[PDB]
Write a structure and sequence with these properties.
two-stranded parallel ribbon, 9 strands, binds guanosine-5'-triphosphate, binds S-adenosylmethionine, binds magnesium ion, Genome polyprotein, transferase, Guanylyltransferase, viral protein
Length: 259
């Protein structure tokens, strides 16, 4: 049993009020008041982020932890926050975005955010059985939360295997992907093998809530994986009891227009 396993158990044991306060203590949170209503009413001429994912990927790019370029593939695009971010980057020439959709899953939001015309969305697509194709940048933000850490570990393992398949097709592609449950043993083993062959490392974004252990793997960074995970598990375990609120910041606005 790992520190992350203990964190998950302590999380599940919170009362409702305890969980709510812990979830957001000390986290950066974009102000989505305007964006949320525009999307709800069906406004398409908007550059405000379609989800909280946009600011997360922007942070990784602005830190130099990812370098989005060329032909990008967004595996599990959901509402499209990462696809719209990538399409706005001058170094990106095209985005192919795929998501399963259906009951309980978010379909792409359709807006004129800058570079929208460079995105090809395909909903109703399972990426785990889809054959890889050529790409310069492979992104994947898949990892559905579950109160069961063993399920979260298996979900994470499937994402890492997907990334190995895309790297097999594209050995030189840059990769950025969510690692939902990085502390599980089969996840450590799989990440170690990934890092051995492809380089990379893990990083925690400041927008990720304390109710998730998610870390992002990128081929553009480095770092001992076990040390990265345990550092994160301890920061999460130490935040239990903190009463400070979230840190509110403006939502990303990418502007509108074609590229
Ligand atoms: N103690 C407690 N734990 C909870 C509760 N709800 C969720 N959790 C735990 O927190 C984990 C993450 O919960 P969520 O924040 O809803 O997961 P998410 O993927 O971010 O969900 P979205 O907000 O829809 O994006 C769950 O897998 C549970 O382990 C709750 O009401 N009480
Ligand atoms: C919420 S999204 C990522 C958020 C996105 N990066 C953004 O910025 O809006 C994760 C998506 O992956 C989708 N997904 C999960 N499993 C999938 C699968 N096997 N194939 C395709 N899409 C999948 C889920 O429906 C979900 O919408
Ligand atoms: Mg989660």
């Amino acid at each position: 049993m790992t520190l992350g396993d203990l964190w998950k158990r302590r999380l599940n044991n919170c009362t409702k009020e305890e969980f709510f306060a812990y979830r957001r203590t000390g986290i950066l949170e974009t102000e989505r008041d305007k964006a949320r209503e525009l999307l709800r009413k069906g406004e398409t001429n908007m550059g405000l982020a379609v989800s909280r994912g946009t600011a997360k990927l922007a942070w990784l790019e602005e830190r130099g932890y990812v370098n989005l370029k060329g032909e990008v593939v967004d595996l599990g695009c959901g509402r499209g926050g990462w696809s719209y971010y990538a399409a706005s980057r001058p170094a990106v020439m095209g985005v192919k975005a795929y998501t399963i959709g259906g009951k309980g899953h978010e379909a792409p939001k359709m807006v004129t955010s800058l570079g929208w015309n460079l995105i090809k969305f395909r909903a109703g697509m399972d990426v785990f059985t889809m054959q890889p194709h050529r790409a310069d940048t492979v992104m994947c933000d898949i990892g559905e939360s579950s109160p069961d850490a063993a399920i979260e570990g298996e979900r994470t393992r499937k994402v890492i295997l997907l990334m190995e398949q895309w790297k097999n097709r594209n050995p030189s592609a840059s990769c950025v992907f969510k690692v939902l449950a990085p502390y599980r043993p089969e996840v450590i083993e799989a990440l170690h093998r990934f890092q051995l062959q492809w380089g990379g490392g893990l990083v925690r974004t400041p927008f990720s809530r304390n109710s998730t252990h998610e870390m992002y793997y990128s081929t553009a960074i480095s770092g001992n994986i076990v040390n990265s995970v345990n550092v994160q598990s301890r920061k999460l375990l130490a935040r239990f009891g903190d009463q400070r609120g979230p840190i509110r910041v403006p939502e990303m606005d990418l502007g509108v227009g074609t590229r």
